[model samples]
Target: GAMATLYKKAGLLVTIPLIKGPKGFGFAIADSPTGQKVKMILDSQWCQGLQKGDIIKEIYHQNVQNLTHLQVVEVLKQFPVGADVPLLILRGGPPGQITKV
Candidate 1:
């Protein structure tokens, strides 16, 4: 899979947008508790750089490990939000980056 970087807008990493059954972060599926895939991007402007079929590959330079969606949310809660932070993501597909509002 190809990798890309996107700005998380600092503290804006407040929520993981985890859904009840399978719909996560816009139709994304947690195929397994270990990994989650983005099935579709939401209509919100914050999801601009991200597209459907993306996967939650990593965070803060660390590989997306066994952490569940809830755990992911909690981990991000500890991050400072007011500044622009770089996020490493797997777009189903590089070193390029994008910013979200």
Candidate 2:
């Protein structure tokens, strides 16, 4: 079957390919103590595509306001290793670009 062939070739894609990677990220985030509704991400190692002072705008295409810190952590942990989590972030420092981490 074509599905079987593709699966054999890329079973990671068939399952949770998000769980595949090497070293894990050291980044962390939480609701800012500054009275902001957005979560504050710590610029740490192993973190990718995310910069210090980045704003977590959304998760899984949904507004971050609807997601709790635990929910976001759970989603980030689903990556298991690193990258490909599709974490939507806004870099507040430079061009304020939206990034997927």
Candidate 3:
């Protein structure tokens, strides 16, 4: 996982086109009370446009706000290696704060 050195107000919806690398998506998610939250973003090509704290709202254009951590992982696994993984994420929160996952 990589550390966030800076942050800005990100209370907005954004779509990220991530490329699945040989290892994986290069990111991790955790089950949150509200939804699935991004827990980590690796410093790798697979995580190019991803950020920590992103709330996954959709996967493959399907609503996944109610999906569990494992379920989301499974959804990602359906894609083949080097495939484009489209993700709808909600990135919004305070900035300049460091929190542990």
Candidate 4:
């Protein structure tokens, strides 16, 4: 398959833990500085994007490096000038969608 070929030739993806009931493995909503709201992102958007039960690993801000949501907010707090960065996410495991990566 094309996807398989791309993955085999391009070592470009990684995974993170799933959103379990336990801490660091749950869901949350985020409000972009410009008033965009992302809801149930961990358990919804990313999940639906890749398929249910899928987890989130990274949050990239348009141009900023990947970060945890809070880390994104924190760095933005320290430097409001960087608050405009858009958010991104990545999931999936070494051989499949990540439940635990």
Candidate 5:
């Protein structure tokens, strides 16, 4: 799964599109609860111009049945924490990553 690097200073990181269900929500992983909250972008090709900012919270894998923004945050905390922030997002759309043929 191809991915990309986002912010660096704020320690904020995110995948270009995402690596889950519909690839609309980017998967974020942090070490501790105090870990920096990051902003994930859904490629316009996939998910563009998000409107539900208040809805997008946090979550963890331990509990992912009913996914709410809050629960999503918890999932990120489980994501790998280190010097480099890694993410896997599809370069294109549901059709797939686009490339010049």
Candidate 6:
């Protein structure tokens, strides 16, 4: 399948540890036609290692493949401030490519 091919040929998959800030995670997520991506990085300290356009694959070791936008938000909200959230990110992939795998 094309989707599987894309995933197989896609770029690096990396885990980034981002600290939860006082206001939020210091980053925003947008539910795109392809998947959830980092829309913006507001705080440098908390958003370190995260880049806009990076596809979100998991949060805190939980796969977000079948989760909705709000559900993903709830998962992030479960963590307290200052907690380190490990984000599974797919970097260097074609932006907006559907990634259901």
Q: After superposition, which runs of candidate 2 have C-alpha atoms over 4 Å from their true positions?
A: 1-23, 33-46, 93-101
TM-score per model over all chains: 0.44, 0.46, 0.76, 0.25, 0.22, 0.79
Clashing pairs in 6: none
Whole-model lDDT, candidate 3? Answer: 0.72
Q: Rate the local accuracy (lDDT) of all candidates.
A: 0.41, 0.44, 0.72, 0.34, 0.29, 0.77
Candidate 5 TM-score over all chains jointly:
0.22
Count of backbone collisions in candidate 4: 2
Which candidate comes out best when scored by TM-score?
Answer: 6
lDDT score of residue 73 within candidate 2: 60
Candidate 2, residue 44: how far the Cα is off, in Å: 6.6
Runs in model 5 lying further than 4 Å from the true structure: 1-66, 83-101
lDDT (tens digit, per residue) of candidate 6 on 1-101: 98767764787788988888888777788887767888877786886788887878988788897887777777887788899888998876555322211
Question: Candidate 1: deviation at residue 95, Å?
Answer: 22
Task: Give the per-residue lDDT digits (tens) of candidate 3, residues 4-86.
Answer: 32323436678888777877788877777657777787644776677877888988799987776777787887778889878
Residues 1-101, candidate 4, lDDT per residue (tens digit)? 98966654553333322222223222443444322123344543222333332223343324334444555445434423212222333333343112211
lDDT of 1 at 3: 23
Candidate 1, residues 40-76, lDDT tens digits: the string is 4554333346544455666656665677766655554
Minimum summed lDDT over a 10-residue window in model 3 is located at 1-10
lDDT of 4 at 46: 22
